Amino acid sequence: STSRLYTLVLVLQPQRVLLGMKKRGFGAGRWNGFGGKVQEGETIEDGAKRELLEESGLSVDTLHKVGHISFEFVGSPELMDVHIFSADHVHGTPTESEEMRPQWFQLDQIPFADMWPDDSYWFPLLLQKKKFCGHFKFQDQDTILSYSLREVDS
């Protein structure tokens, strides 16, 4: 049983981060970066850009490679293969979409309590400008059974 490709784009700036409140579907009622499924016929980076445009209304020329996290759940055959990107520069205005309502948070005021539990572990690596690689086994949606997390030169 193989995995499916996901992207996650974190809109960063010197003092703040633009998260998105998920309004519907998987992760509804939680703050997260912008992203979703990688389709057939686009590269992973194209998918990241697309989902950022569609969910926030923002454009980019380029993204940074910051993380590669593989998620799995107990009693589930399908794995999430997440390619995490930072967008430290953006064009346009943040606009509320059907799927996401964007909001700015200062980097010392990130609402980890209402984000996915894994974010508390890998966000510090992102904010130190470290590239990271890891696996997370979830018991349920609020409970990490086991996890592995390391930095990489890549």
Ligand X SMILES: Nc1nc(NC2CC2)cc(-c2cccc(Cl)c2Cl)n1
- Residue numbers in the known binding site for 8-oxo-dGTP are 7, 22, 32, 34-37, 51, 55, 99, 116-119
Secondary structure letter of residue 37 according to DSSP: B
Work out whether 31 is an interface residue with ligand X (CB under 6 A). no
Rounded to an integer, what distance in angstroms lies between the CA atom of residue 125 and that of residue 129?
A: 6
Instruction: For the CB of residue 135, give the shortest distance to ligand X in the complex, in Å.
Output: 11
Instruction: For the CB of residue 91, give the shortest distance to ligand X in the complex, in Å.
Output: 22
Rounded to an integer, what distance in angstroms lies between the CA atom of residue 87 and that of residue 16?
A: 12
Q: How far is CA 81 from the centre of its chain?
A: 11
Complex with ligand X: residue 36 or 94, whichever CB lies closer: 36
Rounded to an integer, what distance in angstroms lies between the CA atom of residue 58 and that of residue 3?
A: 28
Work out whether 34 is an interface residue with ligand X (CB under 6 A). no
Of 13-21, 24-32, 59-67, 99-107, which segment contacts ligand X by CB under 6 A? 24-32
Residues annotated in a binding site for Mg(2+): 35, 51, 54-55, 99
Six-digit token string for 59: 């454009």
Rounded to an integer, what distance in angstroms lies between the CA atom of residue 94 and that of residue 106?
A: 16
Interface positions, 49-108, toward ligand X (CB under 6 A): 71, 82
Binds ligand X by CB under 6 A, chosen from 18, 19, 86, 119: 119
Residues 6+ positions from 95 with CB-CB distance below 8 Å = 56, 57, 102
Q: How many residues bind ligand X (CB under 6 A)?
A: 13
